[PDB]
Amino acid sequence: IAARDLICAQKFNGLTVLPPLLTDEMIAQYTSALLAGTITSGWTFGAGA
Amino acid sequence: QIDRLITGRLQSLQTYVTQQLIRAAEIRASANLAATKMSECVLGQSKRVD
Amino acid sequence: SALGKLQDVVNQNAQALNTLVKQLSSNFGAISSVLNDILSRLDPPEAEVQIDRLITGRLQSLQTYVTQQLIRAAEIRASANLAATKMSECVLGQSKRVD
Amino acid sequence: LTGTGVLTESNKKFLPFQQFGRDIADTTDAVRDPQTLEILDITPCSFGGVSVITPGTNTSNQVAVLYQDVNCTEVPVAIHADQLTPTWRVYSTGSNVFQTRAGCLIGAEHVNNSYECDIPIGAGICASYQTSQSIIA
Amino acid sequence: FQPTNGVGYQPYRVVVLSFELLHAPATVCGPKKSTNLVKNKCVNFNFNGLTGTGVLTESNKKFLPFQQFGRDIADTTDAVRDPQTLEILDITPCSFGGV
Amino acid sequence: DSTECSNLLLQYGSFCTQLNRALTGIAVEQDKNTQEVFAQVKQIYKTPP
Amino acid sequence: TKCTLKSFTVEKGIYQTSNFRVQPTESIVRFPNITNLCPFGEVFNATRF
Amino acid sequence: DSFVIRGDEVRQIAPGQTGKIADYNYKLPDDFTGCVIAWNSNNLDSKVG
Amino acid sequence: ASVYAWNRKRISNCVADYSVLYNSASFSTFKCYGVSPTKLNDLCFTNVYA
Numbered sequence: 104i105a106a107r108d109l110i111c112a113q114k115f116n117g118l119t120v121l122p123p124l125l126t127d128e129m130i131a132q133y134t135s136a137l138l139a140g141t142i143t144s145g146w147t148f149g150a151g152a
Numbered sequence: 153q154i155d156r157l158i159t160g161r162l163q164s165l166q167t168y169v170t171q172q173l174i175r176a177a178e179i180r181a182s183a184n185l186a187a188t189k190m191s192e193c194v195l196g197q198s199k200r201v202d
Numbered sequence: 203s204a205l206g207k208l209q210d211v212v213n214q215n216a217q218a219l220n221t222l223v224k225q226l227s228s229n230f231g232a233i234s235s236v237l238n239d240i241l242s243r244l245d246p247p248e249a250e251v252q253i254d255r256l257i258t259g260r261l262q263s264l265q266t267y268v269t270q271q272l273i274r275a276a277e278i279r280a281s282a283n284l285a286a287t288k289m290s291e292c293v294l295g296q297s298k299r300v301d
Numbered sequence: 302l303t304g305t306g307v308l309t310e311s312n313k314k315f316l317p318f319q320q321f322g323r324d325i326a327d328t329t330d331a332v333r334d335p336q337t338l339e340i341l342d343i344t345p346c347s348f349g350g351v352s353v354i355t356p357g358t359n360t361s362n363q364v365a366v367l368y369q370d371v372n373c374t375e376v377p378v379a380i381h382a383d384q385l386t387p388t389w390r391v392y393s394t395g396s397n398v399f400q401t402r403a404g405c406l407i408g409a410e411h412v413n414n415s416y417e418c419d420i421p422i423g424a425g426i427c428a429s430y431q432t433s434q435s436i437i438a
Numbered sequence: 439f440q441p442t443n444g445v446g447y448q449p450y451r452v453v454v455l456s457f458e459l460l461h462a463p464a465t466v467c468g469p470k471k472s473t474n475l476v477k478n479k480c481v482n483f484n485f486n487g488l489t490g491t492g493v494l495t496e497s498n499k500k501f502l503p504f505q506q507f508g509r510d511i512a513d514t515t516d517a518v519r520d521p522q523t524l525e526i527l528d529i530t531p532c533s534f535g536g537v
Numbered sequence: 538d539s540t541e542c543s544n545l546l547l548q549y550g551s552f553c554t555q556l557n558r559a560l561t562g563i564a565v566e567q568d569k570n571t572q573e574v575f576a577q578v579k580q581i582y583k584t585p586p
Numbered sequence: 587t588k589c590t591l592k593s594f595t596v597e598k599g600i601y602q603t604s605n606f607r608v609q610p611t612e613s614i615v616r617f618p619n620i621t622n623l624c625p626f627g628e629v630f631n632a633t634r635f
Numbered sequence: 636d637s638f639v640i641r642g643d644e645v646r647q648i649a650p651g652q653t654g655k656i657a658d659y660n661y662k663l664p665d666d667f668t669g670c671v672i673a674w675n676s677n678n679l680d681s682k683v684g
Numbered sequence: 685a686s687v688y689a690w691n692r693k694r695i696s697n698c699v700a701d702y703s704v705l706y707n708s709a710s711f712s713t714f715k716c717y718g719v720s721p722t723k724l725n726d727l728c729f730t731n732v733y734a
């Protein structure tokens with residue numbers, strides 16, 4: 104959930120859940136960039152222009 | 153006695169690791185398929201069938 | 203330096219072998235780490251128990267080494283199948299694939 | 302019952318025939334003190350899961366530390382910096398304080414500009430060694 | 439003590455021997471007779487109580503005067519100092535080569 | 538919360554160190570996985586109205 | 587990091603470290619408020635079991 | 636197997652044990668499966684004189 | 685010496701043959717910790733104190 108407390112970690116007895124490298128907001132921004140690029144420019148999105 | 157208990161706990165952790173191995177293998181297979189679909193079908197047109 | 207992936211493979215193999223030999227360096231809760239002292243000092247009705255503990259620890263260590271080599275081999279197959287696909291699609295012919 | 306750890310006050314309720322409690326049956330979570338009938342829950346002494354982001358030893362010897370899933374105001378409470386060495390007290394608190402979703406990071410200088418990153422910290426943060434010369438996040 | 443007491447009150451002379459096993463050169467040990475040294479052959483060996491099987495070669499290592507038993511990786515004794523002749527012989531196991 | 542922890546670590550902590558290294562490698566390859574599936578192009582075009 | 591990795595040179599990246607930093611210095615004992623001694627003598631010197 | 640010994644040699648009648656009796660009179664194997672029966676016989680065996 | 689002030693004696697540079705001790709006396713208690721009595725012959729000892 105990335106908002107967990109450390110009391111859950113001591114409940115786990117040493118097991119921890121590391122947050123992912125990419126935030127869900129950053130994933131949404133990447134998806135938005137992909138959609139805008141493909142709808143506007145077509146396959147020239149991939150070549151770079 | 154502590155050797156027996158710690159050996160049991162370490163075996164439990166190692167079995168957890170081998171289960172995570174199955175999970176990571178399946179996840180990497182599906183994610184490589186997803187990366188192939190990202191390379192083909194959204195950035196271009198795919199002549200592949202189904 | 204940009205060839206980080208191959209040097210990474212060499213470093214992971216080096217760290218795996220070093221961790222294995224330092225696992226063999228341990229005594230695994232016996233009277234001595236070396237097998238010869240255990241076999242020399244104690245008579246069979248408990249030297250066999252001590253040697254059993256030492257052999258069980260060493261076998262667990264080598265099997266964990268096998269488990270780590272499984273992760274390494276899986277990543278190597280992912281990269282190498284990608285390499286073979288890139289080969290047969292890009293040097294033996296032209297690729298219509300994007301990026 | 303002997304052990305090493307740090308105990309806090311607990312809100313649990315104990316039955317009159319129960320003195321020792323286990324949530325997960327491998328460690329005793331809470332005890333009832335024999336003199337005062339309050340219930341005190343015992344937590345491990347060292348906890349928080351510190352992770353050290355570093356460059357190579359060949360490059361530099363200055364490191365930065367991340368304490369996983371903690372708040373930056375509770376770092377001296379969590380790591381117990383008063384019993385630690387004064388070298389470890391430098392990484393307990395200082396001028397550079399960055400609070401991430403992954404945890405509290407001490408030992409690197411935060412920069413607003415963004416680059417491609419090679420050290421994966423997590424929660425959208427990365428590390429690199431280029432800026433004298435210091436670790437940046 | 440009185441000779442008319444029971445066994446629970448009879449005198450019991452106790453001598454307790456405290457000794458360390460195979461960390462140093464040995465001054466005192468048992469009645470077994472020493473034999474010849476067969477170098478560069480597979481033979482059951484017994485160097486200062488360290489029993490085992492293997493093939494021993496000449497070594498170029500140097501031992502400190504308080505060191506008798508050496509370990510490179512702490513599970514096998516790489517080299518021993520012979521009790522009669524002060525030359526250092528490194529012991530290798532009998533079967534090797536990986537056929 | 539053991540009374541003796543240094544002896545326990547120096548006799549049985551290298552197994553946990555290797556397993557923690559395995560979990561760290563799994564976490565790193567998961568991060569690289571989401572990187573390679575969502576970040577094939579590193580270009581951000583704003584979504585047009 | 588050098589102690590957990592069992593090497594004097596570490597490479598670039600993140601590493602998870604075990605606890606080598608804190609050691610206990612003081613000891614406390616908490617026992618119930620019991621004052622009287624047990625009748626072990628009375629049981630043990632009994633004229634007839 | 637039946638014999639007569641003293642009181643200080645019943646401990647020597649045991650697998651993996653040293654002594655004059657174990658070395659020179661009666662030795663038990665290391666992988667011994669059996670029961671050793673011993674009792675005092677000061678009445679019948681030890682005659683006057 | 686008495687048990688409150690026990691005498692400690694260093695034994696070195698000799699041959700620890702306990703086979704001659706059979707005729708001298710019979711030991712009611714003989715327990716070896718960390719070493720086996722049967723394997724007491726084929727070992728060599730660094731520092732011996734009595």
Ligand SMILES: *[C@@H]1O[C@H](CO)[C@@H](O)[C@H](O)[C@H]1NC(C)=O
Binds near residue numbers: 336337619
């Ligand atoms: C136990 O005895 C001490 C000493 O008299 C006292 O201070 C404490 O309050 C007592 N605890 C109780 C009665 O729970």
Ligand SMILES: *[C@@H]1O[C@H](CO)[C@@H](O)[C@H](O)[C@H]1NC(C)=O
Binds near residue numbers: 358359
């Ligand atoms: C770093 O490595 C280079 C070679 O890769 C070597 O020449 C140099 O001495 C090293 N420096 C240190 C401080 O280890």
Ligand SMILES: *[C@@H]1O[C@H](CO)[C@@H](O)[C@H](O)[C@H]1NC(C)=O
Binds near residue numbers: 372
């Ligand atoms: C950390 O403490 C500050 C103190 O005001 C608070 O504002 C913040 O929400 C806390 N962060 C978390 C993750 O609890």
Ligand SMILES: *[C@@H]1O[C@H](CO)[C@@H](O)[C@H](O)[C@H]1NC(C)=O
Binds near residue numbers: 413
């Ligand atoms: C970075 O942004 C923060 C936002 O408040 C600002 O206070 C700070 O001065 C900025 N630093 C630089 C170097 O631009």
Ligand SMILES: *[C@@H]1O[C@H](CO)[C@@H](O)[C@H](O)[C@H]1NC(C)=O
Binds near residue numbers: 523
């Ligand atoms: C040990 O004694 C034998 C027999 O006298 C002798 O041949 C050998 O040289 C001696 N070893 C020494 C003195 O190191």
Ligand SMILES: *[C@@H]1O[C@H](CO)[C@@H](O)[C@H](O)[C@H]1NC(C)=O
Binds near residue numbers: 626628629631632
């Ligand atoms: C036994 O000891 C108790 C003290 O524990 C004492 O009160 C009692 O008189 C003793 N009885 C005899 C017979 O010594």
